[PDB]
Design a protein around this ligand. Sequence first.
Ligand SMILES: NC(=O)c1cccc(N)c1
Length: 181
Amino acid sequence: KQQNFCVVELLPSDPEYNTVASKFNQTCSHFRIEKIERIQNPDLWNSYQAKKKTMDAKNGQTMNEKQLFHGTDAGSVPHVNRNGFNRAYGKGTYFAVNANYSANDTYSRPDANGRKHVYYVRVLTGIYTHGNHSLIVPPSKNPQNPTDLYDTVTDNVHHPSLFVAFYDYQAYPEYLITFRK
Ligand SMILES: NC(=O)c1cccc(N)c1
């Protein structure tokens, strides 16, 4: 209901820290990471976890969760910590498999400080397929009962570089990376 939240800065020389970053620096090493913050919103975590449990029931052996990158403007950050992604491949939120997709300044706009922002996000990819621009939601998995859909969409199922989610509680903004270049 009241998705209040706190922002904890990760200490350089931490496990959790090095892990994130690692994956970030994996394509964005030419970048200077000013700060990294974990975002703690119990209401988002709950609504997300619930979502996962019911997917964990639905998709058999599937690995529903992925940790993907997302870049926005500084102005969006506050909204994201509170609200976390509220309402060519469709109209949803785009997450990148690799940090560098997100680093484009069309996405992670730079502020006056030239400081940039990318969330390292828990996304319930679940079962996915190729998406197209005419998508407000994911396509049905079969034509017979068009009711049961996919969980998300990608550019390429056998070697995706991005996922597009369409629902209000499918991602949790666990970390915020602030970097400079
Ligand atoms: N904004 C993003 O992180 C992103 C991810 C994948 C694709 C696009 N176009 C954007």
